[PDB]
Amino acid sequence: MKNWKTSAESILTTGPVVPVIVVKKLEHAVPMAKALVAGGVRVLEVTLRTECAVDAIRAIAKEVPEAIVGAGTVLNPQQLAEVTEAGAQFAISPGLTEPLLKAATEGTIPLIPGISTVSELMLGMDYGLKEFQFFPAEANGGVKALQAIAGPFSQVRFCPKGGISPANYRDYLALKSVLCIGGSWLVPADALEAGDYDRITKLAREAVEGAKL
Amino acid sequence: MKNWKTSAESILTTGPVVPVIVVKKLEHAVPMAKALVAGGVRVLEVTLRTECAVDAIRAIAKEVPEAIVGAGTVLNPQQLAEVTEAGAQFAISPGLTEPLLKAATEGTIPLIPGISTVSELMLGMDYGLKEFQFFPAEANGGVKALQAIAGPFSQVRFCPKGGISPANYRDYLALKSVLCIGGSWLVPADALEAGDYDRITKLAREAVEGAKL
Amino acid sequence: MKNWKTSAESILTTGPVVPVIVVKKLEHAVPMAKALVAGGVRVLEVTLRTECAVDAIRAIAKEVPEAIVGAGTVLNPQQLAEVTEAGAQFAISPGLTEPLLKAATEGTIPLIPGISTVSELMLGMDYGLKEFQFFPAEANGGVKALQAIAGPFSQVRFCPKGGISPANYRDYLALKSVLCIGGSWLVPADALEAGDYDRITKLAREAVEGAKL
Numbered sequence: 001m002k003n004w005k006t007s008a009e010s011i012l013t014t015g016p017v018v019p020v021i022v023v024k025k026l027e028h029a030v031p032m033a034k035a036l037v038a039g040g041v042r043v044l045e046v047t048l049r050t051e052c053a054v055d056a057i058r059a060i061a062k063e064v065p066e067a068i069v070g071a072g073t074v075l076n077p078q079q080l081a082e083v084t085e086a087g088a089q090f091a092i093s094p095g096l097t098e099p100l101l102k103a104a105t106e107g108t109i110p111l112i113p114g115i116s117t118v119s120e121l122m123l124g125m126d127y128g129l130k131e132f133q134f135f136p137a138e139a140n141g142g143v144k145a146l147q148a149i150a151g152p153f154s155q156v157r158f159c160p161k162g163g164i165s166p167a168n169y170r171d172y173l174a175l176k177s178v179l180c181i182g183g184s185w186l187v188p189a190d191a192l193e194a195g196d197y198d199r200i201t202k203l204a205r206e207a208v209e210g211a212k213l
Numbered sequence: 214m215k216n217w218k219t220s221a222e223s224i225l226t227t228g229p230v231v232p233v234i235v236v237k238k239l240e241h242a243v244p245m246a247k248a249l250v251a252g253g254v255r256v257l258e259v260t261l262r263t264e265c266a267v268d269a270i271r272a273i274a275k276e277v278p279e280a281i282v283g284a285g286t287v288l289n290p291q292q293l294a295e296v297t298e299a300g301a302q303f304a305i306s307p308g309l310t311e312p313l314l315k316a317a318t319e320g321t322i323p324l325i326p327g328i329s330t331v332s333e334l335m336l337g338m339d340y341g342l343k344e345f346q347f348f349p350a351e352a353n354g355g356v357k358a359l360q361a362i363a364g365p366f367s368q369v370r371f372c373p374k375g376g377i378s379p380a381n382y383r384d385y386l387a388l389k390s391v392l393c394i395g396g397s398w399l400v401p402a403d404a405l406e407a408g409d410y411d412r413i414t415k416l417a418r419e420a421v422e423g424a425k426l
Numbered sequence: 427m428k429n430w431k432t433s434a435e436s437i438l439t440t441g442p443v444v445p446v447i448v449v450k451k452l453e454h455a456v457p458m459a460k461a462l463v464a465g466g467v468r469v470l471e472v473t474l475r476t477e478c479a480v481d482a483i484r485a486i487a488k489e490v491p492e493a494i495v496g497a498g499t500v501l502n503p504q505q506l507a508e509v510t511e512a513g514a515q516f517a518i519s520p521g522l523t524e525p526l527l528k529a530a531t532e533g534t535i536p537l538i539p540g541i542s543t544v545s546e547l548m549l550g551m552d553y554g555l556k557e558f559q560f561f562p563a564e565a566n567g568g569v570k571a572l573q574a575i576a577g578p579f580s581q582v583r584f585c586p587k588g589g590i591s592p593a594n595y596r597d598y599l600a601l602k603s604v605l606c607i608g609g610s611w612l613v614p615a616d617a618l619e620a621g622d623y624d625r626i627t628k629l630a631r632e633a634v635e636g637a638k639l
Contacts, residue, residue, distance in 0.1 A: 049365070073365055075335055094365050095331030097339060116330040117542045118521035118561065122501055126523055135331065136361030139354045141565055148565035148588060152475070152499055152520050162361050262578070286578050288548060307578050308544035310552055329543040348544060349574035352567045375574050 008110035008131035011090045012179040014043045016211035019186040029056035033064040035197035039204025047072035054086045061087030077103035101127045116140045138163030150177040221323035221344035224303045225392040227256045229424035232399040242269035243276040248410035252417025260285035267299045274300030290316035314340045329353045351376025363390035434536035434557035437516045438605040440469045442637035445612040454618045455482035459490045461623035465630025473498035480512045487513030503529035527553040542566045564589025576603035
């Protein structure tokens with residue numbers, strides 16, 4: 001997009017795993033982001049599912065500048081403008097809509113919207129997008145489904161998310177159309193609340209390592 | 214909606230089961246609605262799949278005022294206006310479209326549209342809807358798929374329909390996002406053909422009973 | 427459509443099988459189209475997946491009067507206008523979008539767009555379409571899924587495509603809503619190189635024959 005400083009592609013090629021974080025206790029946002037970076041993971045998706053989500057993005061955005069923090073669960077222009085003002089570097093949505101796609105493309109940060117069908121993908125392509133999230137990965141039919149959908153579009157790249165785990169993520173990563181995946185196991189809600197940051201750094205390290213081949 | 218007397222939520226919380234009725238002979242509409250009410254089921258979805266569907270709705274509307282009669286298979290604004298004039302108290306559609314979503318929200322009765330993807334759900338939410346039908350439930354990937362889709366939306370409630378039976382409906386009912394399900398087995402075409410209204414009342418009773426827990 | 431000379435229905439009732447052709451070398455377009463016609467197959471879908479796809483359509487369109495050549499993989503109005511100018515008699519898309527449906531319906535050739543959900547089908551019906559492609563057939567849940575989706579729409583007809591083979595195509599053809607299927611096995615990428623057009627004609631013959639009942 002003529003309006004995006006950083007491309008959606010760069011966001012997804014930074015690493016094989018994008019942690020989908022849920023922050024309960026704002027106080028744990030920064031130490032958490034640092035634990036992940038120490039583990040090799042710098043692209044963080046902070047989902048708008050808690051009251052402090054936006055503040056978490058703003059905090060991380062300024063105290064851990066080495067991290068590329070973004071917003072998750074962006075459902076409409078209002079939230080897009082909100083996380084953009086808070087310092088998010090990218091936004092991810094479980095699905096797409098014209099209003100959201102129109103705000104995104106006129107906005108200043110890349111949006112990587114999720115799709116389940118070829119039509120939704122084509123709608124997204126109508127606005128010039130090439131990077132999408134495949135959601136809910138598993139529910140949509142996993143790897144075989146994605147291969148069927150991706151088939152006709154060589155230039156399109158995806159970030160599968162939904163029911164993906166250490167047990168299956170290499171299966172998605174092995175696809176040509178897949179740049180990375182969305183994993184929510186790098187930050188257990190328990191370890192977060194418990195301030196157990198070493199657990200988090202270990203998970204990230206292993207995630208990254210287990211991605212090779 | 215500022216234009217809806219009764220909410221879509223009330224329609225779905227009335228009972229765990231919503232029978233999806235197909236009427237081929239107008240003469241059986243009233244005696245059928247009464248059989249279901251006698252069995253504990255008062256929310257009836259009369260699908261626009263037969264020539265007498267609308268007349269069936271109008272008849273039930275006055276012959277059985279204890280029943281909340283609605284229309285099913287509403288595909289466009291024309292049919293919405295039609296069943297609304299005939300006395301339908303609610304409308305259900307296998308899918309959604311902006312023309313239909315706009316029409317419904319300006320209209321006077323609640324529309325509970327079906328969705329299969331997050332994008333379709335988000336389009337529906339753009340018009341303020343919170344109650345949707347999950348169709349075709351099974352074909353879309355059943356309970357696991359619905360859980361994936363529902364996940365990001367705590368305030369949204371569904372009414373799964375499509376391939377649901379006595380054998381699996383408690384699985385859907387057990388979900389927090391599910392208020393009720395669409396069942397088409399309460400009115401066996403035959404039973405009706407053989408005017409076994411007692412068969413119908415028995416099925417309804419059992420359906421309701423088998424829903425507890 | 428008031429603007430379409432030939433209907434989308436005629437395109438699909440011409441034969442039980444519509445070959446989805448991939449042409450890499452323009453020199454094989456005409457001899458190939460003739461091989462298929464000799465085998466009984468006259469409706470050809472030349473997919474826009476190679477540089478010479480459009481030239482192949484133009485060549486066949488003028489060289490082989492006994493066939494009905496169309497374009498496949500049409501993703502937007504630009505390509506629709508392009509294949510229309512090249513002589514395509516119909517266009518097929520893996521999905522649908524309002525820009526494409528609007529351009530198509532204002533255009534002069536029938537578009538048979540693919541769908542996976544009821545909503546996408548309803549969007550297509552909003553523009554007056556009745557013939558659709560079911561894609562990706564298998565990935566969407568095959569015959570059971572299609573039956574679920576087709577159910578509420580008696581007037582709608584489909585052309586399943588995606589994972590369909592000589593092993594399952596009669597299963598789809600057996601459905602009342604199905605007029606024909608998209609098969610990509612009538613033209614082996616190999617048969618083209620060695621220039622074994624007889625192999626192609628044999629496959630077409632067998633395809634047609636194996637469709638009876």
